[PDB]
Amino acid sequence: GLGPLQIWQTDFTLEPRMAPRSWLAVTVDTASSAIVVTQHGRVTSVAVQHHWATAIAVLGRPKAIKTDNGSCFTSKSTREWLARWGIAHTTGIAMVERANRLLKDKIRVLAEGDGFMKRIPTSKQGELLAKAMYALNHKERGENKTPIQKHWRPTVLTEGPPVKIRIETGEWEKGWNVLVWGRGYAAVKNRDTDKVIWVPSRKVKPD
Amino acid sequence: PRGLGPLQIWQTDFTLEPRMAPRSWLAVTVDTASSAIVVTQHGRVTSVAVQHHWATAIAVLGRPKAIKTDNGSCFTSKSTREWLARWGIAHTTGAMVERANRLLKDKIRVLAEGDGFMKRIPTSKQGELLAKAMYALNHKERGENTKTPIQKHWRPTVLTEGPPVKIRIETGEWEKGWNVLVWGRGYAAVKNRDTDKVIWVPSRKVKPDI
C-alpha cells in the first residue's frame, strides 16, 4: 500500500545461471519496490523461512506478504512461522514478476560483463548476486526514485529532535533542538536564531 | 578512527562462531558512525569470501569511502586490493567491530539456546537464525539509543559546527578553543576552531564551555 513494510510479494523463480542453487527466492515491497533475493538448491519449506528472515533483516518486518498457493508457501511449518512473526498472509495465484524479469536481466548483464556466458562459477555467485542487489535497490530505475530512497527516505539531519527548555521564569520554551548531551547538559540550538547554549539536562524536555 | 556520518569509515573482521559449524566463519562489518552491522557465513577465510562479504554489506548499507581491518592476509592480497581499487574504497590496517562481534555472538547464543540448541545449531536452521540476529541488531535500539542502527544509518545526525567545549589537554588543564561533533559514552569527536582537524578523545577529557 502507500507505505514501506505494508505488503510484500514473494515468489520463487528459476535462474539456471546460478546453478546448482538455481532457485531464487524473490521478495519485493509493493510500496518501495526494494528487492531481496536469496538462492536455494530446491524449493523447500525451510528455504522460504530462510529467505523471509533475510529480507526482514534487510527491510524490517512487514504487515503482510502475498504469495501464490503452496506448496512450501502453505506448509504447516510456514504458516506456523508466519504466525510466530505476526505476519499476515495472503494467498492468490504482478509486481514480483516484473522483479523477476529485472533481476534475471541484471544477472545476465553482470555475468556476461565478467566473461561468463553460461553458468556462473559457484564461488563468484554470491558477490554477483550482491552486486545485482546493489544495482536494483541503490541505482535509479528511470527518470523517476531508487528503492533505497523510497524505503528509507534517506537524509542528513543537522540537529536532534525538538525540545523545550525552562528559562528564568519556570516556563518551558519551545523553539529549540538538541545537538549533544554531555555531563548532564544538553547543547541546544534555537531553530529561529541559530543560537546554541548549554542547558542543565533537568531543564530540557521533549516537545 | 571513526566516521562522523555513515558510509565514511567501516571496520571489518572475521570471527569464529562454533555454534555455526561447519561453516563457522562469520564476516562482520560495522559502520563506525551508524553502528549498523552486516554479517555473512563462510566455510573458510578467503579473498573470495571477504569480497563477497563486502559486496553484501554494500548492497545493504551503500558504498563506504574507507574500510579498516587488521593485517589479515585476506584483506591485503592482490585480489582484494584490486577489488577495493575497482570500487574506489580506501583501505587501512590501523574495537567497534570487536564490540559488534560480542553483540552478534550474544544474540546468536540467546536465539540458539532459546530453541534448545546449546551446541552446534543444526545446519538447516543456521541461515534463518543468523538473519534473526541481524534483524535484532539493526532494527532494535541499542539500549540508550532512541533510534535503531538502521535509522541512524539512513537518517543520521551530522552537526554543522558543534557547541563549544573545554578539553583536558595532556598536561591536565582545561583548554577552551574546541567544539564537539559527536559525544559518546566512550569517546567524543572534537574539532579545533583553527584547523579542519577532528580528533577522537576520551569523554572524561571533555566538558561543556560556560
Numbering used by the authors:
A (entry chain B): 54 to 146, 154 to 204, 206 to 268
B (entry chain A): 52 to 145, 154 to 269
Article passage:
The following permanent integration of this viral DNA by the viral-encoded integrase (IN) into the host chromosome is a necessary step in virus replication. In most retrovirus systems, IN first removes a dinucleotide from both termini of the linear blunt-ended viral DNA (∼10 kb), termed 3′ OH processing. Next, the same active sites catalyze the concerted transesterification reactions of the nascent 3′ OH groups into the cell DNA. RSV IN consists of the N-terminal domain (NTD) (residues 1–44), the catalytic core domain (CCD) (residues 50–214), and the C-terminal domain (CTD) (residues 222–286), similar in size to the corresponding domains of HIV IN.
